[PDB]
Curated annotation (Swiss-Prot):
Residues where S-adenosyl-L-methionine binds: 59, 77-78, 89-90, 123
Amino-acid positions noted as binding S-adenosyl-L-homocysteine in the UniProt annotation, renumbered to this chain: 59, 77, 89-90, 123
Protein name from the UniProt record: S-adenosylmethionine sensor upstream of mTORC1
Protein family per UniProt: Belongs to the BMT2/SAMTOR family.
Keywords linked to the UniProt accession: Methyltransferase, S-adenosyl-L-methionine, Transferase
UniProt key word Methyltransferase: yes
Disruption outcome: RNAi-mediated knockdown in the whole organism is embryonic lethal. RNAi-mediated tissue specific knockdown in neuronal tissue, glial cells, motor neurons or muscle cells is embryonic lethal. RNAi-mediated tissue specific knockdown in midgut is viable but results in reduced adult lifespan. RNAi-mediated tissue specific knockdown in eye imaginal discs is viable but results in age-dependent eye dysmorphia with loss of cilia. RNAi-mediated tissue specific knockdown in wing imaginal discs is viable but results in severely deformed wings.
UniProt-listed Enzyme Commission number(s): 2.1.1.-
Job of this protein: S-adenosyl-L-methionine-binding protein. It is unclear whether this protein acts as a sensor of S-adenosyl-L-methionine to signal methionine sufficiency to mTORC1. Probably acts as a S-adenosyl-L-methionine-dependent methyltransferase.
Residues of the full protein shown: 74 to 294 of 302
Top-level taxon of the source organism: Eukaryota
Length: 219
């Protein structure tokens, strides 16, 4: 979808949002260090964004945006409609270092490269999950797939969710911060939510710890 490609462009290239949020996290880290906390935290920052970004789209049975000069797009789904969407169960794929391209067995993705993608897009993926645990498991997978400071983009039309609540992890910043993801954009025909792989998972954990009361209230 256009919104995600437009946000990706702003985040890495035209508005520098990756550096805005880097500053905000760095100023939060210093806040805690002036509190006597998080002294030994080491941060993981991305290099200058490459000229071709690596984008993984999960949950679309059609391939929405073809690969283009500055975008290498890999699309995956349990039930692909055509051949340019790879068949995979996102929850079963093993996310591993030491590779750079999907590893296929019998026409099915078995392994994906860890810490490789600038952006992971969930195209209704969470609406297919039978439980809140498995929705969190999708986010755990995305986290392992993302490069430092990469983004997980959730793009959900209002017509395509069930339950009057589009599953966007909006009430889940506590648990998502626990795994290293901080919310960086929410915009409302469609709902769009973006999480960022924070410069330090320990930093994000400590933010969750300070907001544990509100976190457990929302669950």
């Amino acid at each position: 979808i256009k919104w995600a490609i437009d946000y990706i462009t702003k985040y890495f290239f035209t508005e520098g949002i990756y550096l805005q949020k880097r500053q905000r996290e760095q100023r939060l880290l210093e806040s805690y260090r002036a509190e006597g906390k998080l002294g030994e935290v080491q941060c993981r920052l991305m290099e200058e964004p490459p000229d071709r970004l690596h984008v993984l789209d999960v949950g679309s049975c059609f391939n929405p945006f073809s690969s283009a000069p500055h975008l290498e797009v890999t699309a995956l789904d349990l039930c692909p409609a055509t051949e340019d969407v790879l068949q995979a169960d996102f929850l079963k794929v093993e996310v591993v270092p030491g590779i750079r391209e999907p590893e296929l067995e019998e026409g099915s993705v078995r392994r994906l490269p860890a810490s490789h993608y600038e952006c992971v897009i969930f195209s209704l993926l969470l609406e297919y999950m039978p439980s809140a645990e498995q929705r969190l498991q999708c986010c755990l997978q995305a986290y392992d797939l993302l490069l430092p400071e990469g983004i997980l983009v959730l793009i959900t039309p209002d017509s395509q969710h069930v339950g009057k609540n589009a599953h966007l992890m909006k009430n889940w910043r506590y648990s998502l911060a626990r795994i290293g993801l901080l919310r960086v954009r929410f915009e409302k025909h469609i709902s769009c939510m973006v999480f960022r792989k924070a410069i330090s998972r320990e930093l994000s954990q400590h933010w969750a710890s300070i907001h544990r009361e509100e976190g457990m209230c929302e669950e």
